[PDB]
Curated annotation (Swiss-Prot), chain A:
Gene: OPG143
Description of how the protein assembles with itself and partners: Part of a stable entry-fusion complex (EFC) which is at least composed of proteins OPG143, OPG147, OPG155, OPG086, OPG094, OPG107, OPG104, and OPG099. Formation of the viral membrane is necessary for the assembly of the complex. Interacts with OPG094. Interacts with OPG153.
Family, per entry: Belongs to the orthopoxvirus OPG143 family.
Protein name, per record: Virion membrane protein OPG143
Range within the parent protein: 8 to 270 of 377
Biological process annotations from GO: DNA-templated transcription termination; membrane fusion involved in viral entry into host cell; symbiont entry into host cell
GO cellular component: membrane; viral envelope; virion membrane
Main location: virion
GO molecular function, one term: helicase activity
Positions on the Virion surface side per record topology: 1-263
Protein species of origin: Vaccinia virus (strain Western Reserve)
Annotated function: Envelope protein part of the entry-fusion complex responsible for the virus membrane fusion with host cell membrane during virus entry. Also plays a role in cell-cell fusion (syncytium formation).
Swiss-Prot record, chain B:
UniProt name for this protein: Entry-fusion complex protein OPG094
Post-translational modification: Unglycosylated because produced in viral factories instead of the classic ER -Golgi route.
Top-level taxon in the UniProt lineage: Viruses
Protein keywords: Fusion of virus membrane with host cell membrane, Fusion of virus membrane with host membrane, Late protein, Lipoprotein, Membrane, Myristate, Signal-anchor, Transmembrane, Transmembrane helix, Viral envelope protein, Viral penetration into host cytoplasm, Virion, Virus entry into host cell
Coiled coil start-end: none
Membrane topology designation: Single-pass type II membrane protein
Protein localization: Virion membrane
Record-level GO cellular component terms: membrane; viral envelope; virion membrane
The species this protein was found in: Vaccinia virus (strain Western Reserve)
Renumbered residue ranges of the record's region Disordered: 1-16
Virion surface face of the membrane: 1-191
GO biological process: fusion of virus membrane with host plasma membrane; symbiont entry into host cell
Function comment: Component of the entry fusion complex (EFC), which consists of 11 proteins. During cell infection, this complex mediates entry of the virion core into the host cytoplasm by a two-step mechanism consisting of lipid mixing of the viral and cellular membranes and subsequent pore formation.
Family indicated by similarity: Belongs to the orthopoxvirus OPG086 family.
Amino acid sequence: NRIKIAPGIADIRDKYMELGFNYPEYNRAVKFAEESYTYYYETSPGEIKPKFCLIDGMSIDHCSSFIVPEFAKQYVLIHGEPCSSFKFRPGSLIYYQNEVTPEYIKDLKHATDYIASGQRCHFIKKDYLLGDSDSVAKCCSKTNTKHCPKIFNNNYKTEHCDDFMTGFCRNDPGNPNCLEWLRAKRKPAMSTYSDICSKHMDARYCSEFIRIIRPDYFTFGDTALYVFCNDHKGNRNCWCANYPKSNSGDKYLGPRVCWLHEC
Amino acid sequence: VSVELPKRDPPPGVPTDEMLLNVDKMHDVIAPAKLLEYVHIGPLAKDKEDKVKKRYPEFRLVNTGPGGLSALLRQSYNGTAPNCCRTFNRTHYWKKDGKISDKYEEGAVLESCWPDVHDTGKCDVDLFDWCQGDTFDRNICHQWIGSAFNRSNRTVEGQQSLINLYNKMQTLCSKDASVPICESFLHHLRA
């Protein structure tokens, strides 16, 4: 009985809950904090800890009601310190100060159902999060990188985009993104372009691929050339690697390449 | 307590990107995950977490956040040598019903092998046997030999495997150099 709430000398989000009971010394106070600001920064370096004490058995969705959606695109919710909140004020953080102690909270919960336990809201900053293959396609292809994690948008310095780009670059091997993925010089990129160039060795991106691989990984180009020059044996450009003479196909291989000044 | 307790209505919660993550559509995100890297999959139930544990035996389910907010953490690469040492493009494959595929269908199990597995030296023992006889594919064997000549030896197993591969290749070519694999060995030695 005689329930009241009064703001304190601190900020408006923190208040005092006052009980005036018939017993003279139950006319006491409890400092409780309820949040009313939408965060756009960090309470502590590298983390956001709104004063919303998420009680057990309650939806976690409400814990994000206190953060701007733009700012929350790259924050993940983790377990926080144990806390207690009034059932009639779901999420009113209770400060364990002075006579307020968890044992007193348990005694009050046993006496009456005006108290529940839970954990403090705790958001940590890691990176943006992807949720489907369409966002992966957007990030790796670099068509739309407004919200893309570092691992998937780092200019192909890690092999996270290898699997997508392997199939993506067979459709358009002349894409600047595909060539800059090839320039990382990993085995999937070089093998994908070896398969691409074994059929389209007479295209500009295959000239650039040959310029990229050689001399470190010439073995990924030579093989491709071989295939091309065994399929297009009538091509006038495969007449140095694959001489048109039926018996003499390796006529100008190795140092003999200089016996024909056209090669 | 005669006085009715004033009841504050909880503010309407707005979900984040993290809490709107469905593990069923994240097969293109979880698969390329590296070691000791977390991949959050949003809220998860018990049947769903069992399903995720079965579909991703190489990962561990870590309850990062309340309400079942879980993340997958890669622990090891379970890719076998015959499946992914015979090609450079394939990085991971879905195995199910006793068959291997590169396309995801329900009930499959992910199997990923190490990045640049050839550079580590695990594929040498397999491709040495696979590149002799009728099972000789010119592209894969030639590219394997060429990348074995230009190999960045990082771990001790790398040097050990490279030395064993050179010794075995030298012995086999001393036996006979007319076979295609010894022809490629001689060509890359010349190069």
